[PDB]
Swiss-Prot record, chain A:
PANTHER family per record: 60S RIBOSOMAL PROTEIN L37A (PTHR48129), LARGE RIBOSOMAL SUBUNIT PROTEIN EL43 (PTHR48129:SF1)
Compartments where found: Cytoplasm
Gene name per UniProt: RPL37A
Purpose: Component of the ribosome, a large ribonucleoprotein complex responsible for the synthesis of proteins in the cell. The small ribosomal subunit (SSU) binds messenger RNAs (mRNAs) and translates the encoded message by selecting cognate aminoacyl-transfer RNA (tRNA) molecules. The large subunit (LSU) contains the ribosomal catalytic site termed the peptidyl transferase center (PTC), which catalyzes the formation of peptide bonds, thereby polymerizing the amino acids delivered by tRNAs into a polypeptide chain.
Renumbered zinc finger spans (C4-type): 38-59
Protein name as catalogued: Large ribosomal subunit protein eL43
Length: 85, 43, 72, 247, 106
RNA sequence: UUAUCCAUUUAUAGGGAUGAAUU
RNA sequence: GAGAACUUUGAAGACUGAAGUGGAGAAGGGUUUCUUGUCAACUGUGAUUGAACAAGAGUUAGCCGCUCCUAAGGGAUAGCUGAAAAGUGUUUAAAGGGGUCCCCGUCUCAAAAGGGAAACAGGUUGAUAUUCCUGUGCCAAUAGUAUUAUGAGUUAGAUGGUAACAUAUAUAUAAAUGAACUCCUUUACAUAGGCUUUACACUCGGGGUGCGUUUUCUUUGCACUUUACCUUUAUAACAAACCUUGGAAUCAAUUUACUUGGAGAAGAGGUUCGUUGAACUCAAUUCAAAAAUUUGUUUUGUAGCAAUAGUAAUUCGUAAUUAUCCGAAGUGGUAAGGACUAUCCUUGAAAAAAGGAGGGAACGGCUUUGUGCUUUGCUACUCUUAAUACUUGUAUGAGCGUACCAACAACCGCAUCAGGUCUCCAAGGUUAACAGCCUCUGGUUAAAUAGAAAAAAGUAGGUAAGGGAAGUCGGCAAAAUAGAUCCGUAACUUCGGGAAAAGGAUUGGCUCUGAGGACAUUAAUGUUAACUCAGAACUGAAACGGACAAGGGGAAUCCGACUGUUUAAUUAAAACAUAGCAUUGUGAAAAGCCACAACUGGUAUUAACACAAUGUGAUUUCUGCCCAGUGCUUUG
RNA sequence: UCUGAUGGAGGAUCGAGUUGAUACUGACGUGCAAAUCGUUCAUUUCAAUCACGUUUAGGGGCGAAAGACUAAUCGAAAAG
């Protein structure tokens, strides 16, 4: 069934490193490899390709984004201010 | 080695040729002999 | 090596001036036949036959103005 | 004593940048009449990873106007630009994310990247991943514009200087914890030979002023003067203060 | 079990000295080293190889098969089918969308 | 701004209202 | 042979044993190679041997490499410094090519494992062979004319397919024009994981060709049966790419895994690239029905080389013919390919060289007018592949390497030194296994010695009654199970582990038995390929992963979080590093740090999520008071 | 939610080889050897191992730091 109670994909790390270190990478695993939404077809199938490069599973067209999220709040706010003019 | 340069091979041949003894007729009237295993000609 | 049974294309080569060599087998299927071979300057012309009479006819259809030879 | 580790770095034998796989210098388009008096639009064909840096690069094709032909320019990509979009560079370029504009033409409060601190520098400031400067003021007479850099510093740059509109991509890269020595090794393998560090206090006194002793301590104050020579500048150089800050 | 031996003068199994042995009419196992498989030319839109061509090395492609080099069409197979039809379906699209503009500009 | 110094380039257009485009 | 434990031959007993004293290997060596002769010294005993000595001989390339390209980088040029020596290498390139004015552009070296024109088989020598010989190919190159043909297109260039797709089978499938200028592609690239294909490897039973225990049993134990480079071969399936069309929903195709889709799926029809380069009647026919030509049923061929070369058994002048060469499969050991999935604060070379394209400078002829142009008559014409023959130099094919060792005595360790020193291959049995152990081809039976005796002592082991650490600084050393299956598994914990915790049982030997896939007929019955379980017996010296191979556990304390690194030759650790934490400096070519005699340079192909300089050293919880002193730092 | 059902991550584990060198403070210590031999031991998907090429040269280099290494030479190499 559910093999890991709380560790999740950090189970690859065993008991090494701090529990709080793994639990602070906890805030980020469930979204680093996540399938985000592509705005050129509309299927939530974008994948982490490199540090700042992102790709969906349909377009084969690449987007510059965040380190482990497709968009970061800092850039979204800036785009909002620019677009409101 | 099997693969070698022309100058190296010519020098090897010259050093081989310089390793024969004094001719018998001349002796009837040498110190610089090497063995391949004893003294290396340093090339 | 060119396995062939069409007759017109095989008799087409009957004018090529540079074919020289011929090879005669005696192969027993179980029936005595032969697999005649001729010489081609760019491939290895060898014919598999089906009829002994046909093999006999086409080993004489050759113009004999050149060499004769056989491995056996 | 002998020459210390920090002193040997300037010789540049093994401390030169590991740059075998780098894709090229990230530079803005060279200043041209077209860029000086209006938009010129280039198409970003591809977004590449430069092994040294964390910020992805944009391969923008510009069709040259002095001859038949296209020209390839490698520009640090802001967060949001995508393969196939058209990017306008120039005085009359519209103010949108990724466009290259003169600094005095944009309104104030806008976030910018790839800042060029002297006109014609084709990009000098604000280039690390996730970094952005903000336009905090236009001079009343023009020809001068005030920005706030990611360090919090406040700078005045002439209004003709160009910059990219938006923030540098791959933002937040320093957030995830480096779990192990291995990925730090891989990180610095494509940058430099600055890792591992080795404490100067664990060395011998011949190689470091912190070295020596029976108990592995510095022994003398670690705040060194700004005028200290090369083999002496090892502690906290010209430190205005020490200890935890208070905000 | 029989045993092997190399001939090509490059005795390190690099990716240009890949070995395959087959039995010879003499009765013993000799070494046959194959050439390197070469990549295929691709389209610029969605990163796909072009069809109607094969992928010989440059030396062999200097002698390659022409009808298996390019399709006799427009650019010659520079674009895959699903993207060259997209290019077409956009082609006169823009040529209509420009024409409507200067007409409606008055 | 002429001495002097710095940067950029292919020293490549006088100031104001994801398809191409050379002979 | 004067002389034989260590020269040769034959017989035996053994070893190396699939990770080899085996074949090829580079570096290094340099004639140690081969034949003949030979023993003054050497070959730590002998020696007739030899890598010793002496005389001769031996290395054959258009296809194997170098040579070419570029990389980390080296040298140099212009400058600029410097007394020079030297340092640096565009820091005000007046610096080689293209096409026909312009465009482009430092030079040179650096890879015998990176990129790359093109070769295979058989045979041959005392010593060379993918180099020589036989045969069969391949690649690059090839100046001006008169003949030919083929194919095309034409009185400036085709084909269908509702579509994807494909489109010229002459000796060869060449035969669908093209400048400047430009834009792509190939070369060209990481790791991990499994799936799949194919070749090779190995193996299985009944067919063709030989040896054997058999006091006792035997269809008896075993042993010898091939096919290179050369063909998109066609295939075929599957891998993937691609169109009409159903237009799903009571979503569907599917993979080992997830992958995909209303920007097209069930479901249907349809077509290239990628493999292995005989497979499905592939190249035909005997014959039938379709029809101005196809589908099916029968005969030839180890799909085409190909057997005739090579290999093998019995006779036979000492030179030969003989006959076989078959149906199939099964395991997955090694390679390569394919389509995928995953990983990176790591994204995993370049150039020579080749190709494709956009564009449209220039495109049918003979002769004739005036000045490449209008023009008058005729219109057959032009290229692609192969050449034929006269003309320039002679119009193919440089130069270098090629023997042998590669350690076991040919290399480095002063040596013929138990040391050191860069790939592939792998049957059984046993196995999880390229482990260990034994054998099979190949190699060896040699080690600076041999006999005899066999006490002490040494050294490398083995076993010891009863006790079981009483020994000793200290359980040092050795013993103790240790594989697999089933069961069971505590404290503590960062919830991931601890854990093979701890602790049990079985496995022996045999008679057994039973159960778990692909191939077909109108719920059933026939051909043919597993190793997982189970309980009843009995049995055998109450004992069995039988050899080999293979954890000792537990309770705690100290240190270091961990993986890692270190004093080559006395210290491997608690030391170093490490992630994490924190501090400091720096907004740039008038900056921070550092190099340099100067010139100039590294960081820097960089830009505060950066660089530089420190301290501490996972996580958790904390990190108190002191600025007097010494430092550092800021104002006036 | 758990109970069962499907899979291939990790500077994960054992373990040959490779790379080393914990202990016997074994042998040897006029050695096979100016560092070897035997058993035992650590290590094997990565901060991994190896080869060639290449860069850094002596008050210099290089150093996961031992005053380590820089050709049997190192708290300043070797040669004159």
């Amino acid at each position: 069934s559910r093999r890991t109670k709380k560790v999740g994909l950090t189970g690859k790390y065993g008991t090494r490193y701090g529990s709080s270190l793994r639990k602070q990478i906890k805030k980020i695993e469930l979204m680093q490899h996540a399938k985000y939404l592509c705005t050129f077809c509309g299927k939530t199938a974008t994948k982490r390709t490199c540090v700042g490069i992102w790709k969906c599973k349909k377009c084969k067209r690449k987007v510059c984004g965040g380190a482990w999220s497709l968009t970061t709040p800092a850039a979204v706010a800036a785009k909002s201010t620019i677009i409101r003019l | 080695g099997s693969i070698k340069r022309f100058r190296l091979k010519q020098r090897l041949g010259k050093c081989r040729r310089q390793n024969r003894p004094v001719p018998h007729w001349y002796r009837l009237k040498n110190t610089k002999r090497r063995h391949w295993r004893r003294t290396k000609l340093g090339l | 090596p060119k396995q062939i049974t069409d007759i017109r294309k095989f008799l087409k080569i009957s004018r090529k001036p540079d074919t020289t060599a011929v090879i005669i087998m005696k192969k027993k299927s179980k029936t005595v036949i032969t697999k005649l071979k001729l010489r081609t300057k760019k491939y290895l012309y060898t014919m598999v036959f089906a009829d002994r009479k046909k093999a006999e006819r086409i080993e004489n259809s050759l113009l004999p103005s050149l060499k004769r030879i056989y491995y056996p | 004593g002998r020459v210390i580790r920090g002193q040997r770095k300037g010789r540049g034998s093994i401390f030169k940048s590991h740059n075998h796989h780098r894709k090229g210098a990230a530079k803005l388009r060279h200043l041209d009449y077209c860029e000086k008096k209006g938009y010129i639009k280039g198409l970003v064909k591809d977004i590449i990873h430069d092994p040294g840096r964390g910020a992805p690069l944009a391969k923008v094709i510009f069709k040259r106007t002095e001859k038949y032909g296209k020209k390839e320019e490698l520009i640090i990509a802001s967060e949001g630009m995508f393969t196939g979009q058209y990017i306008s560079c120039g005085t009359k370029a519209p103010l949108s994310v990724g466009n290259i504009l003169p600094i005095g033409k944009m309104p104030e409060g806008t976030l910018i990247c790839n800042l060029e601190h002297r006109t014609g520098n084709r990009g000098t400031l604000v280039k690390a991943s996730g970094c952005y400067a903000t336009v905090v003021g236009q001079s009343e007479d023009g020809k001068k514009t005030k920005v706030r850099l990611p360090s919090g510093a406040k700078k005045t740059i002439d209004a003709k200087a160009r910059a990219m509109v938006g923030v540098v991509g791959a933002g937040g890269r320093i957030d995830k914890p480096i779990l192990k020595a291995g990925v730090a090794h891989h990180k610095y393998r494509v940058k430099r030979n600055c890792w591992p560090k080795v404490r100067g206090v664990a060395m011998n006194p011949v190689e470091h002023p912190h070295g020596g002793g029976n108990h592995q301590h510095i022994g003398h104050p670690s705040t060194v003067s700004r005028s200290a020579p090369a083999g002496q500048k090892v502690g906290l150089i010209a430190a205005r203060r020490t200890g935890l800050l208070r905000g | 079990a029989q045993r092997v031996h190399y001939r090509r003068h490059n005795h390190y199994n690099t990716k240009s000295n890949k070995v395959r042995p087959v039995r010879t009419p003499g009765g013993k196992l000799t070494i046959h080293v194959v050439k390197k498989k070469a990549g295929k030319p691709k389209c610029a839109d969605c990163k796909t190889a072009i069809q109607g061509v094969k992928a010989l090395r440059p030396a062999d492609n200097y002698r390659a098969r022409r009808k298996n080099r390019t399709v006799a069409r427009a650019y010659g197979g520079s674009i895959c089918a699903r993207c060259i039809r997209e290019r077409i379906m956009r082609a006169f699209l823009f040529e209509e969308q420009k024409c409507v503009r200067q007409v409606l500009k008055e």
